[PDB]
Design a binder for this molecule. Structure first.
Ligand SMILES: CN(C)c1ccc(O)c2c1C[C@H]1C[C@H]3[C@H](N(C)C)C(O)=C(C(N)=O)C(=O)[C@@]3(O)C(O)=C1C2=O
Ligand SMILES: CN(C)c1ccc(O)c2c1C[C@H]1C[C@H]3[C@H](N(C)C)C(O)=C(C(N)=O)C(=O)[C@@]3(O)C(O)=C1C2=O
Ligand SMILES: [Cl-]
Ligand SMILES: [Mg+2]
Ligand SMILES: [Mg+2]
Lengths: 179, 200
């Protein structure tokens, strides 16, 4: 009866209310109106659930995972970074939930497509990987800072700061794509 | 009664043992061998303590806060970023505790420095903030990865398997350095650009 899709859907809703710190097995089980073992069947620990949410957030919101036809690689990385940022900001503690996670089997497929697309535009395999990792780290760090300050007590400044750092990061890749 | 510096020192000590989540008022009072009211005298809540820890980490480990005499602004930003990274890496949940903290004298001094190196006041702010966000992001993911328990072994394709096997002879410093060098190389170009690079 209770499928993995329904659990994730209920968990993302509950996450936005309580946050990742207050999100527990009992709360999610009570929200789904099931006993804890039915939920434990899907996720044996909190980290396993948060990993599934991290994947779900991108699957739902992260629209620009892959390069489009006749898209400049600089435009792709900007749109990819903005799309990734939007996905983390869409849910409470999105950046902190994403932190430490390694790509899933599909994400490795999309990552390889990104790496090969950059390699075709003059990047060396190593500097393509570092560029994509550097962008993801920059976004996670920017979103964490935004979500951290919002949790406590100028968003125009964060938006302007993010866009300038992202454009700078891409402008830098142009020069340092290959030795 | 104990001074604010002694509580902060003891709190930094516990942080590296138990972590942010386990850093309770009981543990800190038991460590200092005092009653809990003694702690509440200095810090009314945990966020106030974590704000003090965030500053204390930089005061302790962050050595390159200001540029040296006749130091190139690009060299400063790299050494400043590496010094800031070192400070956050030296403490459990370092990047996580820093996140959300806002300035002030040293921050304003760094803005005026870049402002004298072909930056515009807004872009000087954005540049400094952007660097800190890249470092906070890099440290958070590394600290999260080390706390939550190989990338070459998971890779389903031969291309990624072989590539990650080579990148495991470079180190994590190589990856961070490239992103930092790219970020600063970007500033060098976009600091005096007439195009809008803070929108879209
Ligand atoms: C394969 N590859 C280079 C790695 C290796 C280790 C990693 O820890 C990661 C990657 C890929 C990058 C790609 C980036 C990509 N982007 C540059 C923002 C991205 O759009 C995605 C995505 N799901 O499309 C990521 O997963 C991503 O955020 C990510 O989480 C990564 C990531 O964490
Ligand atoms: C005024 N100014 C530009 C702001 C505004 C909002 C902010 O949220 C911040 C700054 C300064 C920047 C400076 C950077 C600096 N650097 C680029 C790494 C830095 O070295 C320091 C430092 N204490 O030396 C920071 O606090 C800093 O990491 C930081 O946390 C900042 C920060 O969080
Ligand atoms: Cl190389
Ligand atoms: Mg990631
Ligand atoms: Mg800061």
């Amino acid at each position: 009866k209770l499928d993995k899709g329904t659990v994730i859907a209920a968990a993302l809703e509950l996450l936005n209310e309580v946050g990742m710190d207050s999100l527990t097995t009992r709360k999610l089980a009570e929200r789904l109106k099931v006993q804890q073992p039915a939920l434990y069947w899907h996720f044996q620990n909190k980290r396993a659930l948060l990993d599934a949410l991290a994947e779900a957030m991108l699957a739902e919101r992260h629209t620009r995972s892959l390069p489009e036809e006749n898209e400049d690689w600089r435009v792709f990385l900007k749109e990819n970074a903005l799309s990734f940022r939007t996905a983390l900001l869409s849910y409470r503690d999105g950046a902190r939930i994403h932190a430490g996670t390694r790509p899933t089997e599909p994400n490795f497929g999309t990552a390889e497509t990104a790496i090969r697309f950059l390699c075709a535009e003059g990047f060396c395999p190593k500097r393509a990987v570092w560029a994509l990792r550097a962008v993801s780290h920059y976004v996670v760090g920017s979103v964490l800072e935004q979500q951290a300050s919002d949790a406590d007590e100028e968003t125009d400044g964060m938006d302007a700061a993010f866009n300038f750092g992202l454009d700078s990061l891409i402008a830098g890749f142009e020069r340092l794509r290959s030795s």
